[PDB]
Ligand binder design. Structure first.
Ligand SMILES: Nc1ncnc2c1ncn2[C@@H]1O[C@H](COP(=O)(O)OP(=O)(O)O)[C@@H](O)[C@H]1O
Ligand SMILES: Nc1ncnc2c1ncn2[C@@H]1O[C@H](COP(=O)(O)OP(=O)(O)O)[C@@H](O)[C@H]1O
Ligand SMILES: [Mg+2]
Ligand SMILES: [Mg+2]
Ligand SMILES: [Mg+2]
Ligand SMILES: [Mg+2]
Lengths: 430, 434, 49, 42, 126
């Protein structure tokens, strides 16, 4: 399910690992990056352990080298049932919400809670349902026949039960599930399904709810609408201070458990200094997600200050975070990556075209060639041949310019292009 | 008769089946490589396989960037959604720039559904209340071909009471959405009063209950707004509900993911088909770095439709950045995921052909000599100026009753109107700041 | 046949003059989507409350 | 979901009562004489 | 077809003219009266008829204009319709119009009949 066409990370699934945590050369869509995969795997098992919370880790490296794909493989390897939050640095800036509250809201979103409830439900086919008007003898008299394969019995309704059966029109011969404790009816189909067995069964219902979702409901009359509508608007901190204690008591009673989810922040270099100052306090608290931050830039100016801090982050935040460095890809890895994308996009590449695509990948960038591999398939589609050819790769190379070539063209054509001073010449002669 | 503003002479890219671009097709001269690489992008969009791909075209002013970006929208067809957008529109007072940028990505992917609606119509015979709670009402609607009675919800009864319907008045009731419309009093009661303000309509022909199916297409974002906020309804509680929070709000990622899931469950039944679209942003050089860096992460998403950018600049500083200098006013990290389509300036002959075809589409006759003058103009001043002076010359020809443009008329138009180069010369030598 | 031609043209002759073809123009009522995602979280709100 | 419109017959439908119903099967019949005479005389 | 007549009555009624309809759905007593009423000087601008019913043998001299929405056969049968207007008692020239759509079957019919000099039509294909 979940219709998706093609994604950049669509190929890599779950990073890759062995029981010794030693990464394989090619494992589950992940090539290259030996040490980075091992450190990211240590972080993954650290999250799965859940003994430690509120720790920050930094992923550093050149652009287009082993950075976002790491956190993607960690999120996919973490699997469903555990929370993972990915937000851009520009997304926390909001006109309606303050930067601090919008920054705390993610920390509340990244930690979930599982709540279990036991219910007794009676489900089965209804062959015959009789309902009678009020009489002097009794308020209402009715009998419904719930037929199942193993057992078939008749129940006498409870008044307001009759108001639930008359409330929503029910036709005999459909499979429904009636909730005794909840007091509502659930129709599972028509008799589409078959009766499994005994009418009444005791089941437990587990509900995974994040701390944020618990926090919004209590601050509003209807808070679940404030979840979807994003109108939440700076919940009081007192409410959260009550939520934490109530959750603690729920844990001591054993009625709930907490899952230490992960919080991933893309583009942390563009975060404001105030947010950096709040993160330091937010990490040291009791409930906090494991934080992973990735910045492409380094030795730049922090937003909000005049001075340039190293890596673009304040040193106070760098103390709380552990740094992981990624290395540029070699020539032998680029061809394997482009081959993985070829297998992902249903694109057939000859070895002769793979050599040129690898050479162009080394000379310019990987992101470029991986964009060309998609474009060349249509030029090959006009030739009606199923496999891409060298000539199609060259045509796709001359049609769509690179960045380095476009800069060298702009420098010669600068008189035609607009300039920072606003000067342009649209006249050909004189 | 036919209004023409800087356009409508371009009916498409005009490419053959082999992908080769003709010298002259559909109001396009020169620019063969850009039309070819553009048609490749057209086929890529028709393939639907790629997602989150970005292609920008960089060229000087008047080079035809935007005019080429309209041709791809004409080539995709009206069935494929196209969203023209300007980089200056991403700044909004009510909502942050980020939400306004993410929203357009959802507006660019169209999803067409099919659904059947039930319709009841007929003249009302009896109206009775079944009366804490507002009781239901039995309606006696009388079709021309039959008679049927139906019980109604209390809300649609409230809408009925607000429409001032009476016994013997033709009404229209929608089943699914519960909408209520009254056509008018029945034609048989027209003789009850000699003078009345109420019009009389004939009895609806056919059965009371009627069905049909609609292929109606709705953009995905329009479907998201429905789940996000309430919408108009004939009941008072609906008007108060929509009037409680009129201001637009930012949508959380959770609601978006759920709507995407129900979209998938809709495509599993074969009822709907998801098709991508093209997002076009004019003057990308006007965007702050905060929108660029968000475009870095947003294009990596799978649901992100193909986006096309246009900027004309040299090496310049990115808006919102102090010391950063990058080509085309775009950051270097964002330029990596982008593919570039270069545009070239036209020669004298191509300017002459442009003015010719624009004159033919404008429906105006131009003599050869005045046409050569317009070409020399186009070379010595600008391409836009020669296309600009065309109409005033025709107006002066209307004043002189002439049916064709003459050299004297285009010269007089040169005397009455000035371009930028002359006005700057008057600006350099003046008394007080002309 | 000769009958299929006439009976096929009578529909065009039932169009050009007036849209007599069954003349159904949609009233353009809104979409019927019944999901209301918040209703799925209503029960969770009840349990948490 | 719940239908806001419900078709109803004037004579057959009543808001009072709501009724829904769907080798060789044979309905059980008591052959006892005192049972039938007991039923008819009560 | 008679299904155009009611729509035309809702139109003429929308624009508020004075009209009278004569077709196969009327009686014999209301026919001659609706005829003499139109022939004598009155305020009725338009008189609606049908091809087979009242477009064959009547005497009407009143109208100076003939309008044809659709014509199937016009070697003869349609010629009788406008000849119902032009008569011995008309001192004014008859202006006869015709309604032909563009790029439709009716547009192909007269275009094929103009080249063939309008004898008889068989199949319309274009
Ligand atoms: N180890 C890897 N294995 C496979 N593909 C990779 C790997 N590292 C990077 N890529 C490719 O790089 C592209 C995105 O690069 P990314 O990791 O986002 O760079 P950055 O995070 O520095 O912006 C993806 O399309 C992915 O295919
Ligand atoms: N190849 C072409 N053929 C015909 N007209 C063109 C061509 N290229 C540009 N034009 C005309 O130039 C005018 C302005 O060009 P425009 O696309 O606005 O330039 P820019 O992309 O620099 O804004 C348009 O109205 C268009 O009709
Ligand atoms: Mg990144
Ligand atoms: Mg501290
Ligand atoms: Mg432009
Ligand atoms: Mg005669």
């Amino acid at each position: 399910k979940s219709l998706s066409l093609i994604a950049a990370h669509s190929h890599i699934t779950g990073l890759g690992l062995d029981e010794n945590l030693q990464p394989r050369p090619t494992s589950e869509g992940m090539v290259g990056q030996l040490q980075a995969r091992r450190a990211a795997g240590v972080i993954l098992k650290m999250v799965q352990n859940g003994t430690i919370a509120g720790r920050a880790v930094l992923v550093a490296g050149p652009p287009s080298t082993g950075k976002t794909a790491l956190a993607m493989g960690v999120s996919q390897s973490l699997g469903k049932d555990v929370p993972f939050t990915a937000i851009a640095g520009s997304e926390i800036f909001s006109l309606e919400l303050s930067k601090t509250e919008a920054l705390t809201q993610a920390f509340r979103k990244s930690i979930g809670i599982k709540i279990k409830e036991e219910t007794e439900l009676i489900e089965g086919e209804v062959v015959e349902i009789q309902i009678d008007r009020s009489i002097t003898g009794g308020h209402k008299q009715g009998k419904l026949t719930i037929k199942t394969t193993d057992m078939e019995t008749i129940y006498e309704l409870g008044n307001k039960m009759i108001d639930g059966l008359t409330k929503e029109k029910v036709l005999a011969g459909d499979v429904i599930s009636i909730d005794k404790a909840s007091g509502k009816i659930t129709k599972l189909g028509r008799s589409v399904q078959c009766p499994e067995g005994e009418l009444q069964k005791r089941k437990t219902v587990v509900h995974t709810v994040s701390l944020h979702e618990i926090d919004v409901i209590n601050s509003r009359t209807q808070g679940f609408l404030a979840l979807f509508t994003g109108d939440t608007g700076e919940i009081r901190s007192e409410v959260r201070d009550q939520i934490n204690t109530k959750v603690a008591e729920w844990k001591e009673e054993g009625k709930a458990e907490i899952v230490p989810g992960v919080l991933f922040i893309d583009e942390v270099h563009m975060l404001d200094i105030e947010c950096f100052s709040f993160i330091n306090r937010a990490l040291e608290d009791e409930f906090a997600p494991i934080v992973m931050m990735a910045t492409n830039r380094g030795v730049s100016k922090t937003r909000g200050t005049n001075y340039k801090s190293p890596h673009g982050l304040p040193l106070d935040l760098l103390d709380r975070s552990i740094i992981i460095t990624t290395k540029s890809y070699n020539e032998q890895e680029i061809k394997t990556i482009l081959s993985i994308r070829a297998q992902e996009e249903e694109v057939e590449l000859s070895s002769d075209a793979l050599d040129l695509l690898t050479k162009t990948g080394v000379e310019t960038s990987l992101r470029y060639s991986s964009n060309l591999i998609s474009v060349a398939q249509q030029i090959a589609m006009k030739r009606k041949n199923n496999t891409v050819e060298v000539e199609d790769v060259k045509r796709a190379y001359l049609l769509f310019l690179d960045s380095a070539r476009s800069v060298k063209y702009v420098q010669e054509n600068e008189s035609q292009y607009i300039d920072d001073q606003g000067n342009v010449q649209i006249s050909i002669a004189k | 008769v036919t209004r023409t503003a800087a356009h409508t002479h371009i009916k498409g890219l005009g490419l053959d089946e082999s992908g080769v671009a003709k010298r002259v097709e559909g109001g396009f001269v020169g620019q063969i490589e850009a039309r070819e690489a553009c048609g490749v992008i057209v086929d890529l969009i028709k393939a639907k396989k790629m997602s989150g791909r970005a292609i920008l075209l960089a060229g000087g002013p008047s080079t035809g960037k935007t005019a080429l970006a309209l041709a791809i929208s004409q080539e995709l067809g009206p069935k494929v959604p196209f969203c023209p957008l300007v980089g200056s529109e991403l700044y909004s007072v009510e909502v942050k720039k980020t939400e306004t940028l993410m929203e357009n990505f959802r507006r660019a992917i169209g999803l067409r559904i099919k659904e059947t609606k039930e319709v009841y119509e007929g003249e009302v015979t009896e109206l009775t209340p079944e009366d804490k709670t507002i009781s239901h009402v039995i309606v006696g609607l009388k079709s021309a071909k039959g008679t049927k009675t139906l019980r109604l919800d209390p809300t649609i009864y409230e809408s009925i009471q607000r429409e001032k319907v009476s016994i013997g008045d033709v009404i229209y009731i929608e089943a699914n959405t519960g909408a209520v419309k009254r056509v008018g009093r029945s034609d048989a009661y027209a003789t009850e009063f000699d003078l009345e303000t109420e019009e009389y309509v004939p009895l609806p022909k056919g059965e009371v209950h009627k069905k049909k199916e609609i292929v109606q297409d709705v953009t995905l974002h329009d479907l998201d707004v429905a789940n996000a906020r309430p919408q108009g309804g004939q009941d008072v509680i609906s008007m108060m509900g929509q009037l409680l929070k009129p201001k637009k709000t930012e949508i959380t990622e959770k609601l978006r993911q759920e709507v995407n899931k129900v979209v998938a469950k809709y495509i599993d039944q074969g009822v709907a088909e998801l098709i991508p679209g093209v997002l076009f942003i004019d003057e990308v050089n006007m965007l702050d770095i905060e929108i660029f860096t968000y475009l870095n992460k947003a294009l990596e998403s799978n649901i992100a439709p193909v986006v096309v950018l246009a900027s004309n600049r040299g090496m310049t500083t990115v808006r919102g950045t102090e010391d950063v200098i990058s080509p085309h006013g775009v950051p270097p990290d964002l330029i990596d995921r982008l593919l570039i389509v270069r545009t070239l300036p036209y020669d004298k002959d191509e300017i002459r052909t442009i003015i010719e075809r624009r004159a033919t589409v404008e429906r105006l006759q131009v003599e050869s000599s005045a046409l050569d003058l317009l070409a020399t103009m186009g070379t010595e001043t600008s391409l836009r100026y020669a296309l600009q002076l065309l109409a005033p010359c025709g107006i002066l020809a209307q004043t002189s009753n002439r049916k064709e443009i003459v050299v004297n008329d285009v010269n007089e138009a040169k005397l009455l109107f000035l371009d930028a180069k002359r006005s700057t010369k008057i600006l350099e030598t003046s008394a007080n700041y002309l | 046949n000769f009958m299929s031609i006439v009976n096929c043209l009578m529909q065009l002759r039932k169009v050009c003059n007036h849209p007599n073809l069954f003349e159904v123009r949609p009233i353009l009522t809104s979409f019927v989507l019944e999901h209301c995602v918040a209703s799925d979280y209503k029960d969770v709100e009840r349990t948490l409350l | 979901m719940k239908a806001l419109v419900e078709e109803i017959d004037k004579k057959t439908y009543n808001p009072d009562i709501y009724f829904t119903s769907l080798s060789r099967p044979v309905k059980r019949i008591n052959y006892s004489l005192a049972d039938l005479e007991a039923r008819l005389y009560t | 077809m008679t299904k155009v007549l009611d729509v035309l009555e809702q139109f003429l009624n929308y624009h508020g003219y004075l009209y009278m309809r004569l077709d196969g759905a009327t009686k014999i007593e209301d026919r001659q009266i609706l005829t003499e009423r139109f022939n004598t000087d009155s305020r009725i601008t338009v008189f609606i008829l049908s091809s087979r019913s009242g477009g064959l043998g009547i005497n009407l001299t009143g109208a100076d204009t003939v309008i044809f929405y659709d014509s199937d056969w016009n070697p003869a049968m349609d010629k009788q319709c406008q000849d119902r207007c032009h008569r011995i008692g008309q001192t004014r020239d008859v202006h006869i119009y015709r309604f032909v759509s563009e790029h439709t079957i009716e547009s192909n019919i007269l275009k094929k009949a103009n080249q063939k000099r309008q004898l008889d039509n068989v199949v319309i294909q274009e």
